[PDB]
Amino acid sequence: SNATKTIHNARYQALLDLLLEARSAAGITQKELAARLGRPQSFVSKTENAERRLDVIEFMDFCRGIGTDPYALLSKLEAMTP
Amino acid sequence: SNATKTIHNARYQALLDLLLEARSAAGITQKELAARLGRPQSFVSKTENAERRLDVIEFMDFCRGIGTDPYALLSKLEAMTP
Numbered sequence: 001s002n003a004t005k006t007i008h009n010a011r012y013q014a015l016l017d018l019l020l021e022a023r024s025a026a027g028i029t030q031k032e033l034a035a036r037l038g039r040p041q042s043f044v045s046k047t048e049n050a051e052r053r054l055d056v057i058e059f060m061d062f063c064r065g066i067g068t069d070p071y072a073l074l075s076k077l078e079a080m081t082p
Numbered sequence: 083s084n085a086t087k088t089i090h091n092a093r094y095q096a097l098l099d100l101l102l103e104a105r106s107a108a109g110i111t112q113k114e115l116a117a118r119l120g121r122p123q124s125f126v127s128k129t130e131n132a133e134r135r136l137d138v139i140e141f142m143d144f145c146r147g148i149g150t151d152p153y154a155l156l157s158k159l160e161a162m163t164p
Contacts, residue, residue, distance in 0.1 A: 001103045003096035007162050010092030014085035021083045080089050081163040 013050070015077055020048055022068045036065040095132070097159055102130055104150045118147040 023033060030044040037043065046052040047062065054062065063070035105115060112126040119125065128134040129144065136144065145152035 001096070001099040003099050003159070004162055006096045006099065007092050010089050011163070014083070014088045017083040017085050017088065077085070080086055081093070 011077065011081075014080065015073075016048060016050060018073060018077060019062065019066075022063075022073070023048075023066045026066045026068070028066055033062070033065050037061060093159065093163075096162065097155075098130060098132060100155060100159060101144065101148075104145075104155070105130075105148045108148045108150070110148055115144070115147050119143060 023030075028036075030048070031041045034041040034044045043052075044062075047054050047058075060070045063073060105112075110118075112130070113123045116123040116126045125134075126144075129136050129140075142152045145155060
């Protein structure tokens with residue numbers, strides 16, 4: 001079946017949901033996050049819009065750029081499928 | 083965020099995907115499954131179309147009706163989020 005990818009896609013989308021919540025809470029614009037990352041704003045916007053794939057390395061940096069602990073965010077996400 | 087429900091919905095849809103695979107593999111029509119369950123065909127069709135919610139009791143019976151071990155199916159589903 002397509003179960004494996006179906007579940008992967010939702011967990012990935014939930015992670016994006018959490019990251020958007022975190023950036024918004026931090027009061028940081030996409031343009032500002034991109035500046036901190038030393039990347040074009042398109043990097044941040046495409047990441048948030050799911051038009052490019054985030055790897056775990058980019059993810060760690062994205063988190064640090066907004067001020068949120070990447071290990072803690074992952075732990076919280078994982079806690080959602082006990 | 084909406085993360086918790088986002089993840090729940092995907093796991094539920096993946097379970098339906100697996101159940102459809104199982105009924106199809108068993109060579110059993112919806113009408114035939116319903117007869118075995120002693121329920122209207124609409125029960126089976128709405129279950130498969132996600133137009134009604136399956137509870138764990140109905141799920142066990144649905145599985146037995148198609149010949150597949152409900153405990154094993156759940157285990158397989160859970161294995162997908164290690």
